[PDB]
C-alpha cells in the first residue's frame, strides 16, 4: 500500500466505531506499522486487543491533560521506534453541560479551560513532544468539525476549541514545515460514535446531513479513514495546513 | 449622532493610542454615554482622566482573569445604569514568549491557558455577566486579527486564541440573538499600540501592510473606531455574527 | 448626516421595494446628492418620479449589456458632476430557467454568458468607465448573495456569477486602491423584491431564514440601505475589498 | 493501484510539463484506463504520442468553445466506453492583456466573456454532456488557483473566472450528488507550465512561494497528480464539493 514502511501513532481509539479506529484500519491496509494510546489504567486491556488486532504490541498510556504522560509517551515509544512517521490526533472532550442546550448556560471558565485544554492544546502539545523523533517527511493529522466555522446547535464550547485546533494546524504547519513535516486536519461529518452520544439531539444532525448533503448520505469511519491515510502518506506531500472536509459535501450547501 | 442615548461600556482603554480609545472617541462623537474598565488598582487615576475626557464618571476595575471582578463589574454598573446598550471587548493577552519567534518554542500548557483565558473566554464571559441588564437591541463588539485565519509570523498562540474568539462571536450571536442582541467582531489591521510592542518585528508588519494593502496605507484607531461605532448602532441592526475587516483590505490580497 | 456633500450614482432602482431604493433613502437621509439610472426607454417616467422623490433631476439610461450606454452614462453625468463620490451597483440578471430547478438543466453557454455579463462584468465595467471622474475618497458598492459561497437551491447559475462578482470586488479594490478608492460588497439576506420573484420557492427561503437566523428575523432594505450608506461614507475609510453580510447572521449558522 | 478498472478522460494535456500530464501519470500508475482530448487539428500527433505513452489509443478533439465538439466528444467516447468513471478538467484561457499589468487595463467585455467561457463554463458544460454515460460512483476534477479567493498581481480577469469555477464545483456537486457523482477541485500552487508563461513575472511568484510556503518548496505535477488520483478514486468517496489546496500550504500563511 501507499503507507508501506510508515510508522504511525494513533490516539483516540476507544471503540470499533471510533474515528481513530477507521483510520487505523485504513493505515494498516495500506501497510503501516501502528502504535496506540489509551486513557486510564483500566482501558489497557481493550486497547491491547485492538492493537493486537492490527498486528501491534505497542500501547502506551497518555492522558493529554498530564504533561508527564505526554513526555513519557514519546520516551517510551523511542525505545521501540527511533523514527515516527505519522501522528493521529483523534481526541476531544468538554464537560457535558458545555455542549448541551444554550451556549451561555454551559459556559464557565473551567468548562472553557478543559474543552480547549483537551481538544485544542493537546494537538500541538503532542507535536512538540514528538518533534525530536519525527522523520523529515512525517505527517501530523487531527480531527475537526464544521462547528468550528459555523454555529451548530449544542456544539457550543466545543466549537470554540475546534476553531483554535484548526488555527493550530496552520501555525504547526509553519513551525514544522521547514523540517519537511506536514500538518493537516480532517473536518469530518457527523458519525455515530461514543463521544457523539454526549451531543444533544445528535440524531437530528445525522438525519439532516443525510437529507441535505450533496451525496445524500452520511460518511463512515472508512471514508474518513481513507482520507486520513492519504494525508498521512507521501501521496499528499504537497498538502499541508489544510482542513479537508470529509462530510459528503455538507459544508458546501445551505440545508 | 447615530448613537444618541446609547449606553456603552468599553474595556481595554489603556492609552490614547489604544483601539478602545479610538472606539470611545467615535461613540462619544455620535452621542453615546460611556463607561470604562481598568486593570489593577494603579491605573485607576489614568483611566478616570480618560473617562472625564469623554464626559464620564463611570470607571470600574475588571481583571477578566477573576470571576469576582467580572460579576462585581455589572453589579456596580447596575447602580448607575439599569440598561446596557453596548459592550466593547478590546482585551488581549499572552505570555510574551508565546508570541515571539517559533510557535512551538513558546508553547506551554500554561501559556496556552492564559492566552485563551484572557483573549477568548473573557468575551462570552462578560456577555453572560451583562446579559441580565442588556437592552433588547444591544450590540456586543470585540477585536480580532487576521492571525486567527492565517498563520502570521510571531503571532503564534495568539492566533489560536483569536480563532476561538471569532468562533464565540458566532455562538454568542445565536444565544443572544433570540433576545435581539447582536454580536460582532472587527478584524483590525496592524496599529502601533502598547500591546503591539510585544509582537516581534511589528514594524516589518506595518511596512508590509502599507506596501501591499489595496489602499496602500495602514489603518487608524479612528477608522476602527468609526466601524465599531457603526456596528454598535441601530444602523447595523441587520448585522450580527460578523467578522468585519478594517485593514485597508489587506486580508483580501496576497502580498 | 455622514454623507453630507457626497455625490452618489445608484443603479438598480426599479420599485420602492428594490434594494437600491433602500440604499437611496438611507443615503439621502445622511445628506448625499443622488443620481439614478434606468433600463429601457419606457421606465424613464417611473425612475424620474423616484429621482424627484429624492430631490434629484439626474436620471440616465444605462443597459449594462451595451458598452455604448455605459460610456455615455458617465459622459452625461460629467456635464452635471465633475466628481463622483459613490457608485452603487445593484444590478443582476439571468435567464429564468437558469435559476429554476436543477443547475445542469438550466445550464447553457448562452445563459451562462448572459448571467455573468450582466451580474458580474457590469460592476468592474462601470468602475472602469467612471474612473476618470472618481474622487480620491470614492466608494464603490455592489450587492451579492450567500449563493456565491455555498450552493443554494434554485440559485444555480446566479451563484457562479455572484462568485465572480465578489472576486471582482477584490481585484477592483487593488486596482483602484492606489488612487484611494474603496470597493466593497454587501451580501444581503433574502428580500421580497421584483427579481426575487423569479427564484423558485423564494417563500421557502424567507421562512427558513426567519426561523434559523440568529436574530430570528429577515432583513429590510432599510437595514441593507444603512449598511450601504456606511460603506459609502468616510466612516468606512478603513474598509475595502470586503463582502459584508447583512442577513441577520444567517450565513454564520447551520439551519 | 487504487484506480484499478477506472476509466478516466483527461483534458488539458499539452506538454510533459502540463498539470494534466502529472495527473495522467499518477492515474495510470494507480491502474486507470485513460482517454485524452486535444485542441486544434494540428496537436493530434503530439497528443497521440502522449496517449500511447500511457497505453491509450483514445484521443478526441475538443475545443470547449464549441458546443458541437463537446457533444461529439462524448458521442465518440461512447463507442469505446459505455461508462465513464472520471473526468479531469485541466483547461484555462484568457486573452493575454487580461492577465497582464492592471486589472482594469486588461478588462473588456470580450476578454471577460472568453476567460469565463473557456475557464469556468466549460467544466459544468463537459459535466452535463458526460452525464448520460457517467457511472454512479464517478468523480469529476478541475484545477483552480488561489487567485480566485484573493487578489494576486497580474492574475486579474482569470481570478474572477476561477471564482466562478469553484462555485460551479459546489453547484455541480449538488446536482450530480444524488446520482452518487462527486465533484472536486484542486487549488494548485504555481507550477512552471506552458500557460504559466503568459502570467507576467511568474518567476517572482515561484520564488515567493518557495520562500514563504510552510514547506519552503514549490509543488510538482507529481504532487498535484497524486492528490488528483486520490480525489478520483473511491478512497475519497466521502469527499465532494471540496476545493483542496495543493500548494505546500502557501494559502494558509501571510508571506
Ligand atoms: N464522531 C463524530 O461525528 C465527529 C465528527 C467530527 C469530528 N469529530 C472529532 O473527532 C475526534 C475523535 O472523536 P470520535 O468521534 O472518534 O470519538 P470517540 O468518542 O470514539 O473517541 C474520542 C476519544 O477521545 C479520547 N479522549 C477524551 N478525553 C481525553 C483525554 N483527556 N486524554 C486523552 N484522550 C482523551 C477518548 O479516550 C476517546 O478515545 C474528536 O476531536 C471529535 O470532536 C467527531
Ligand atoms: N494593536 C493592533 O494592531 C491590533 C490589531 C488587531 C487586533 N487587535 C486587538 O485589539 C484589542 C485591543 O488591543 P490594542 O492593540 O488596542 O491595545 P492596548 O494594549 O492599548 O490594550 C489592550 C488591553 O488589554 C487589557 N488587558 C490585558 N490583560 C487583561 C486582563 N487580564 N483583564 C482585563 N484587561 C486586560 C489591557 O489592560 C489593555 O487595556 C486586542 O484584543 C488586540 O488583540 C489589535
Ligand atoms: N432581493 C434579495 O433577496 C437579494 C439578496 C441578495 C442579493 N440581491 C442582489 O441585489 C441586487 C438588486 O436586486 P434587488 O433585489 O434590489 O432587485 P430588483 O428586482 O427590484 O431590481 C433588479 C434590477 O436589475 C437591474 N437590471 C437588470 N438588467 C439590467 C441591465 N441590463 N442593465 C442595468 N440594470 C439592469 C434593474 O435596474 C433592476 O433595478 C442584485 O444584484 C441581486 O442579486 C438581492
Ligand atoms: N500551471 C500553474 O501554475 C497552475 C496553477 C494552478 C492552477 N492552474 C490551472 O490548471 C489548469 C492547467 O494549467 P497548466 O499550468 O497545467 O497548463 P498547460 O498550459 O500545459 O495547459 C492548459 C491547457 O488549456 C487547454 N485549453 C486552452 N484553451 C482551450 C480551449 N479553447 N479549449 C479547450 N482547452 C483549452 C489546452 O489544451 C492546454 O493544455 C488551468 O485551469 C490553470 O488555470 C495552473
Ligand atoms: O466533535 C464532534 C462532532 C460531532 Cl458531530 C460528534 C462528536 C464529536 O466529538 C465529540 C463531541 C463531544 C465531546 Cl464532549 C467530545 C467529542 Cl470528541
Ligand atoms: O492582536 C494584535 C494584532 C496586531 Cl497586528 C498587533 C497587536 C495586537 O494586539 C496584541 C498583540 C499581542 C498581545 Cl500578547 C496582545 C495584544 Cl492586545
Ligand atoms: O441575487 C438575488 C438573490 C436573492 Cl435571494 C433574491 C434576488 C436576487 O436577485 C436576482 C435573482 C435572480 C435574477 Cl435572474 C436576477 C436578480 Cl437581480
Ligand atoms: O491559473 C494559473 C495559475 C498559475 Cl500560477 C499559472 C498558470 C495558470 O493557468 C493559466 C494562466 C493563464 C492563462 Cl491565459 C491560462 C492558464 Cl491555463
Automatic annotation (TrEMBL), chains A, B, C, D:
Annotated residues for binding of substrate: 94
GO molecular function: enoyl-[acyl-carrier-protein] reductase (NADH) activity
Catalytic activity: a 2,3-saturated acyl-[ACP] + NAD(+) = a (2E)-enoyl-[ACP] + NADH + H(+)
Any matching Pfam family: adh_short_C2
Highest taxon in the source lineage: Bacteria
Binding site for NAD(+): 12, 18-19, 63-64, 91, 162, 191-195
Enzyme Commission no: 1.3.1.9
Homology family: Belongs to the short-chain dehydrogenases/reductases (SDR) family. FabI subfamily.
Protein name, per record: Enoyl-[acyl-carrier-protein] reductase [NADH]
Organism of provenance: Burkholderia pseudomallei (Pseudomonas pseudomallei)
Amino acid at each position: 500500500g501507499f503507507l508501506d514502511g510508515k510508522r504511525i501513532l494513533l490516539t483516540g481509539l476507544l471503540s470499533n466505531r471510533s474515528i481513530a479506529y477507521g483510520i487505523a484500519k485504513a493505515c494498516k491496509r495500506e501497510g503501516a506499522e501502528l502504535a496506540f494510546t489509551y486513557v486510564g489504567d483500566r482501558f489497557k486491556d481493550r486497547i491491547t486487543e485492538f492493537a493486537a488486532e492490527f498486528g501491534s504490541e505497542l500501547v502506551f498510556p497518555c492522558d493529554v491533560a498530564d504533561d508527564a504522560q505526554i513526555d513519557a509517551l514519546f520516551a517510551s515509544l523511542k525505545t521501540h521506534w527511533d523514527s515516527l512517521d505519522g501522528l493521529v490526533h483523534s481526541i476531544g472532550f468538554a464537560p457535558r453541560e458545555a455542549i448541551a442546550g444554550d451556549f451561555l448556560d454551559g459556559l464557565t471558565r473551567e468548562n472553557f479551560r478543559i474543552a480547549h485544554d483537551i481538544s485544542a492544546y493537546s494537538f500541538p502539545a503532542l507535536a512538540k513532544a514528538a518533534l525530536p523523533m519525527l522523520s523529515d517527511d512525517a505527517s501530523l493529522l487531527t480531527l475537526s468539525y464544521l462547528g468550528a466555522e459555523r454555529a451548530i446547535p449544542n456544539y457550543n464550547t466545543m466549537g470554540l476549541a475546534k476553531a483554535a485546533l484548526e488555527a493550530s494546524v496552520r501555525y504547526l504547519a509553519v513551525s514544522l514545515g521547514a523540517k519537511g513535516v506536514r500538518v493537516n486536519a480532517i473536518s469530518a461529518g457527523p458519525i455515530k460514535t461514543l463521544a457523539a452520544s454526549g451531543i444533544k439531539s445528535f440524531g437530528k444532525i445525522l438525519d439532516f446531513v443525510e437529507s441535505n448533503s450533496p451525496l445524500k448520505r452520511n460518511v463512515t469511519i472508512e471514508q474518513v479513514g481513507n482520507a486520513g491515510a492519504f494525508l498521512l502518506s507521501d501521496l499528499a506531500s504537497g498538502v499541508t495546513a489544510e482542513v479537508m472536509h470529509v462530510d459528503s459535501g455538507f459544508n458546501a450547501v445551505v440545508g
